[PDB]
Swiss-Prot record, chains A, B, C:
Changing P27L: In FTD1; most common mutation; reduction in the ability to promote microtubule assembly; accelerates aggregation of tau into filaments. Interacts with MARK1, MARK2, MARK3 and MARK4. Interacts with PSMC2 through SQSTM1. Interacts with SQSTM1 when polyubiquitinated. Interacts with FKBP4. Binds to CSNK1D. Interacts with SGK1. Interacts with PIN1. Interacts with LRRK2. Interacts with LRP1, leading to endocytosis; this interaction is reduced in the presence of LRPAP1/RAP. The modification N6-acetyllysine is found at K7, K16, K24, K37, K43, K47. Promotes microtubule assembly and stability, and might be involved in the establishment and maintenance of neuronal polarity. The C-terminus binds axonal microtubules while the N-terminus binds neural plasma membrane components, suggesting that tau functions as a linker protein between both. Axonal polarity is predetermined by TAU/MAPT localization (in the neuronal cell) in the domain of the cell body defined by the centrosome. The short isoforms allow plasticity of the cytoskeleton whereas the longer isoforms may preferentially play a role in its stabilization. Disulfide bonds join C17-C48. This is Microtubule-associated protein tau. The gene is MAPT. It is linked to In Alzheimer disease, the neuronal cytoskeleton in the brain is progressively disrupted and replaced by tangles of paired helical filaments (PHF) and straight filaments, mainly composed of hyperphosphorylated forms of TAU (PHF-TAU or AD P-TAU). O-GlcNAcylation is greatly reduced in Alzheimer disease brain cerebral cortex leading to an increase in TAU/MAPT phosphorylations. Frontotemporal dementia 1: A form of dementia characterized by pathologic finding of frontotemporal lobar degeneration, presenile dementia with behavioral changes, deterioration of cognitive capacities and loss of memory. In some cases, parkinsonian symptoms are prominent. Neuropathological changes include frontotemporal atrophy often associated with atrophy of the basal ganglia, substantia nigra, amygdala. In most cases, protein tau deposits are found in glial cells and/or neurons. Changing S46F: In PIDB; markedly reduced ability of tau to promote microtubule assembly. The modification Phosphoserine is found at S11, S19, S31, S50. It is found in: Cytoplasm, Cytosol; Cell membrane; Cytoplasm, Cytoskeleton; Cell projection, Axon. It comes from the Eukaryota. The chain holds residues 592 to 645 of 758 of the full protein. There is a cross-link at K7, K24, K37, K43, K47 (Glycyl lysine isopeptide (Lys-Gly) (interchain with G-Cter in ubiquitin)). The modification N6,N6-dimethyllysine is found at K37. It comes from Homo sapiens.
Amino acid sequence: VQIINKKLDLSNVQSKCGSKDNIKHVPGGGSVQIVYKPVDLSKVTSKCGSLGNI
Amino acid sequence: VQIINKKLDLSNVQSKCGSKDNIKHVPGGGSVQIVYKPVDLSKVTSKCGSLGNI
Amino acid sequence: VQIINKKLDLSNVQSKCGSKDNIKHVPGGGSVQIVYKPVDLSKVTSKCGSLGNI
C-alpha cells in the first residue's frame, strides 16, 4: 500500500505576501457575516534585469 | 504499508510577510462576524539584477 | 507499517515576518467578532544583485 512523495524544491521569491482576508472559514448555519467599506489601495513595483531559468 | 516522503528544499526568499487576516477560523452556528472600514495602502518594492536558476 | 520522512532543508530567507492576524481560531456558536477600522500602511523594500540557485 506504498505512498512515495520524493519532492525536490529549488523555488525563489524576491518578496512574498500572505493573504489579507477579511472573513474566512466560519462554519455554521444561521450566522451573519458583514464586510463593510473595504478599500485596497496598495501598490506593487517589480523590476528585474533578467527573469527565468538557464 | 510504507509512507516515504524524501523531501529536499533549497528554496530562497528575500523578504517574506505572513497573513494579515481579520477574522479567521470561527466554528459555530448563530455567530456574528463584522469587518468594518478596512484599508490596505501598503507598498511593495522589489528590484533584482538577475532572478532564476542556472 | 513504516512512515519515513527523510527531509533535508537548506532554504534561505533574508528577512522574515510572522502573521499580523486580528481575530483567529475562536471556537463557539452564538459568539460575536468585530474588527473595526484596520489599516495596513506597511512598506517592504527588497534589492538584490542575483537571486537563484547555481
